């Protein structure tokens, strides 16, 4: 049998994205954060093209297509960055981009050291849990459907159905080489715990970038058009409790 679903996920996976950072200059808070912001703007373009090509994405109402992207981009990008770090440098550093790799010194200079250490822990988990390339792809897609508004989406029903379908595909990938219910159950527990762990990290970064935007003119940090719009209009909805992640486990 042909793995149609997985064939598609592999086929649409975005290529390499560079930040455009000048690594010839001594590190500074302003330059490092401005480059992270530009990388965010560039990655946002690839995330939109990727999402629009996902199986069933068009089943969603137009307004909800935009909403899920605007709310889950931070988690999606952090998860992908953690995987790149694992595969390219065995979690020795944070591989934001080929031209923007963070060692401990840069983590400190960025003023978000604690958050950076938590992301490195996430990267290490990909190795400790022996996450396969196929599990990574399915889990990343699921992250796009893991944060919603308390007030509900325009067509909450279509969303619930799509999310359920991606969960079913994850079950299938888990059952592939496993011919025992207990083994599958144990793996599902591990993967759902890993997925939940992304949310608290994304929340801390949401708070950090929000505060940075508010005082950006005082610290010389540049925010591109799309990033500035999303962080001033959508991010505060999550910080004020109007939009919340869907956790598998209670915590």
């Amino acid at each position: 049998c042909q793995p149609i679903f997985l064939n598609v996920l592999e086929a649409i996976e975005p290529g390499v994205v560079c930040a455009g950072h000048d690594n010839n200059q001594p590190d500074s808070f302003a330059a490092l954060l401005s480059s992270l912001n530009e990388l965010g703007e560039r990655q946002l373009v690839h995330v939109v093209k990727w999402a629009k090509a996902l199986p069933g994405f068009r089943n969603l109402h137009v307004d909800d297509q935009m909403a899920v992207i605007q709310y889950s981009w931070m988690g999606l990008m952090v998860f992908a960055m953690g995987w790149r770090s694992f595969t390219n440098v065995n979690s020795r550093m944070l591989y934001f981009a080929p031209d923007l790799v963070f060692n401990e010194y840069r983590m400190h200079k960025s003023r978000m050291y604690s958050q950076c250490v938590r992301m490195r822990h996430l990267s290490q988990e990909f190795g400790w849990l022996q996450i396969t390339p196929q599990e990574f792809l399915c889990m990343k897609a699921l992250l796009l459907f893991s944060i919603i508004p308390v007030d509900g989406l325009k067509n909450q029903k279509f969303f619930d159905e799509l999310r359920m379908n991606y969960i079913k595909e994850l079950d299938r990938i888990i059952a592939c080489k496993r011919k025992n219910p207990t083994s599958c159950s144990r793996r599902f527990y591990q993967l759902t715990k890993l997925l939940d762990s992304v949310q608290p990290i994304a929340r801390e970064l949401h708070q950090f970038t929000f505060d940075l935007l508010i005082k950006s003119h005082m610290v010389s940090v540049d925010f591109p058009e799309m990033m500035a719009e999303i962080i001033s209009v959508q991010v505060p909805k999550i910080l004020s409790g109007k939009v919340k992640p869907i956790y598998f486990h209670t915590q």
């Binding site: 629009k52 137009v62 992207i69 058009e225 799309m226 719009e229």
Partner: peptide, 7 residues
């Protein structure tokens, strides 16, 4: 402006 536009 025009939101993300390329949605």
């Amino acid at each position: 402006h025009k939101i993300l536009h390329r949605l």
